[PDB]
């Protein structure tokens, strides 16, 4: 009935809509293969702050939710679906950490190693606790895959090359089982808003994160980064082709969780253009970046215009 | 009751018996490690034409089947087993495309790129349609594995090295799930003609096709091509050892679908001899090629002598 | 009722407690990264003989068991759990073969190839027979994984580099399915002595054996050996963290089968220190070796003091 009680966790995904984008506009300002466009770095300055403000506000309201109604938090945690959203704040904070604007650090040779330890203490603690709790047959909504690759990226950025290999191995081990189990029962059309958002978006995006983590850790675009990227591209093509355009769709706030895969799948190709200099690669990167940015912007406008003039966004007594 | 109605799709496999062989006799005429044998290229000329004629005749009779009795085609398509034979004509045509005799093209530096696009338009269309139809728990008789590796070979031959990597990645992704699911319930003895031919032959042959596609695309026999080939060899050894010779077997026209794996597993070793010059490798390649050719020839003679003098080959009202 | 009838097969695991250790004390006497410690080779001399004596005695009593009560052997073999112990003698003998003290062979450039063939005749025969018997849905207690990597190590030591690749490929193929199937139902706490010892120890140790076999066969610590080792380390960390220390545990003779994984996971890190010269790697190797040796010694003392003064070690009429 009150505002605090009627608050879904999916609001974390809203941050995932923006923070990942904050990465891409940095790459377009520093990509050696995209110097034809005069993309000023100032475009990155007015996105990182917005993402940080959104994260701060959402974390604030969630903490105010926990301090008052603990029974709601306990009920939400003990769910077969909503567990995957408990890794969201760490991932969003890590994506914000990677994309610091150049103005803050004139010489960012290496970031201080405190942030990585601070952000992987609780992450491994929560992951181990969740896995142990669930272990005591569909092990697809209780294992984390995306966080390991982002952590490998962060560790490589900090300066611990050796550490990031462990995270990459753990992420690969956790991803193989999920890919084996889930692919046989992949959701069909007219099921995107059918209470599966925390699961099927971070399964077509993790293949792309590996293509970035491996390239960052090794520095050479070998065959390892040229296969996971193509697997992600094939999945993207399958989703684009199989969807039913004739049936159509209706607006939902839950669509914000499906913008992360296509947003993180364009930095992969913009970092792939650097390896193979050619017209098709640059055209593909540009068109994917354009469509991702346009969809993000139109979704933001729609959710802004559907929240203030009308007060029907928040469901009551879920 | 009539000839047109009583016509199984497995006739496509007959082409798979010959066209793949047309590849091998080309390799034996150009293998640098098999120049001791004075294998004239003329042996390849009188096999490619035969395979093309067989394909033309079988395609003709199948088209005449479709134009008259559409209900039979609809019933055959909506089956849990017979779907896998709907990828056969494209694979056979592609194998015929790879093994063009040298006489036709005096300087075959690169084939024209039209053929690959013409042959992968419908192939991807059909694969996507079939997967989407089945998705809407044994996902082993509705996914294609062999076609991707042959397409990678064809794309590498044409001149698009970059394209063939995508097909290789897709084939690997589709093969891993099939290998995981099927290996736990591998068919036992006295079950080869038990209505499973479209499935278990293209599971012990796809591991060998990768060893050829990777070598062709990269040009160096690295460790990637030295593991899938050994997996295929181990599967071959298991089939040879476990089969019950005491029980015996009876002649069946359906045996023509099991000659493709051993035929395509000998070009792998004849292209593996080129990497490691040694007596055991050459002996293994020669003996596998000999046994495959002998079995193909004896099967052809048996099916020819069991078709004209006696009119009991075609079952009535399946 | 009699001694011969009341004899479990798990006694083979006792040899696995010692023979693997005989390897480690050899490495500490020859590791270029552990020359600070003045570890004399004499420590290896008084362990290999002990392991050989234990193996001889246990094999003797098991043969005397088979010659008298064949029905007991038949009943033990036809069990859903006890099959995995039928590969133990070959593995222990192979581990004894690898760790021959230097004094016996002044110039051990290459071992004679007879031993490998003698030890892989029966091994492949038994593996194929067991797989064929079981095939005619939890395929986790009838497939062998560890033996292939040890065989690859032995073949590389003998001088047949090419042969050991086949064993590595077979081991990888058999391990992938086991890892996929078993990881979803990994045993929880208070279940280590719950009649699962032949299964869950050789699943957290096989990942480490690959890191040694690949390094031995190729001679360069590439990325292949730096991922399976980390997977094994992650599994080790998960076991250490998740176990319930508050509940405690009671002594059991069956604990001897769980000392093999941590014993074979320390030679991996002592051979990993040679690739990356650094303080953390050496400290990790030293502490793992110390804890493994201490646990082995305390378990041996406990099982010696629980066998002679008290006669309650052997259960009657299992
Ligand atoms: C969707 C993603 C996140 C899951 C991971 C899929 C893997 C099964 C793929 C991705 C990268 C692929 C590997 C990429 C790099 C190599 C090394 C590669 O080396 C070469 O490229 C040949 C010679 C050279 O250039 O070094 C040989 C194949 C192999 C092992 C590939 C095998 C299959 C791998 C491991
Ligand atoms: C039956 C087939 C079709 C399925 C594919 C099985 C894969 C799981 C195998 C086949 C090739 C193997 C890879 C082959 C090549 C490499 C790179 C390889 O590089 C080396 O050979 C070491 C140093 C060098 O020579 O480069 C390290 C292991 C690895 C990744 C192997 C890991 C396991 C792979 C991917
Ligand atoms: C727990 C174990 C026993 C199961 C095996 C897990 C595999 C899926 C892992 C282990 C080694 C990994 C491979 C290790 C070596 C390579 C080649 C590697 O080459 C590089 O390291 C980049 C450039 C170079 O240094 O050669 C690229 C990734 C890849 C294929 C890795 C992909 C994933 C592999 C095959
Ligand atoms: Cl970036
Ligand atoms: Cl996740
Ligand atoms: Cl060829
Ligand atoms: Cl297929
Ligand atoms: Cl050793
Ligand atoms: Cl085992």
Numbering used by the authors:
A (entry chain C), B (entry chain B), C (entry chain A): 182 to 317, 327 to 508
Task: Please give the exact wording used by the authors of the publication that reports this structure.
Slow anion channel associated 1 (SLAC1) is a slow (S)-type anion channel that generates anion (Cl- and nitrate) efflux on the guard cell plasma membrane and acts as a key effector of stomatal closure. Trimeric SLAC1 harbors N-terminal and C-terminal intracellular domains (ICDs) with the transmembrane domain (TMD) positioned in the middle. Multiple serine/threonine phosphorylation in the N-terminal and C-terminal intracellular domains activates SLAC120,21,27,28. To reveal the activation mechanism of SLAC1 unequivocally, here we report cryo-EM structures of AtSLAC1 with different phosphomimetic states: wild-type (WT) in an open state, 6D (T62D/S65D/S107D/S124D/S146D/S152D)29 in both open and closed states, and 8D (S59D/T62D/S65D/S86D/S107D/S124D/S146D/S152D) in a closed state.
HEK293T cells expressing AtSLAC1 WT evoked robust ionic currents compared to the mock-transfected cells. Since we prepared AtSLAC1 from an insect cell expression system, AtSLAC1 were likely to be phosphorylated by endogenous kinases of insect cell origin as similarly reported. Highly conductive AtSLAC1 WT showed predominantly the open conformation, whereas less conductive AtSLAC1 7D and 8D exhibited mostly the closed conformation. We also determined the open state of AtSLAC1 WT and the closed state of AtSLAC1 8D with C3 symmetry, at resolution of 3.8 Å and 2.7 Å, respectively. Both closed and open states are nearly identical to those of 6D. Cα atoms root mean square deviation (Cα r.m.s.d.) between the open states was 0.58 Å, and that of closed states was 0.42 Å. To exclude artificial features from enforced C3 symmetry, we also conducted refinement without symmetry in both AtSLAC1 WT and 6D open state. Despite no applied symmetry, all protomers of WT and 6D open state are almost identical except ICL2 and ICD that have asymmetrical distribution as expected from weak density with C3 symmetry. Nevertheless, ICL2s are extended from the center of trimer, and connected to ICD regardless of applied symmetry. The density of SExt is weak and dispersed, reflecting long distance, weak electrostatic interactions between a chloride ion and K347 and K461: 5.6 Å/4.0 Å in the 6D closed; 4.4 Å/5.1 Å in the 8D closed; 4.3 Å/4.7 Å in the 6D open; 5.8 Å/5.8 Å in the WT open.
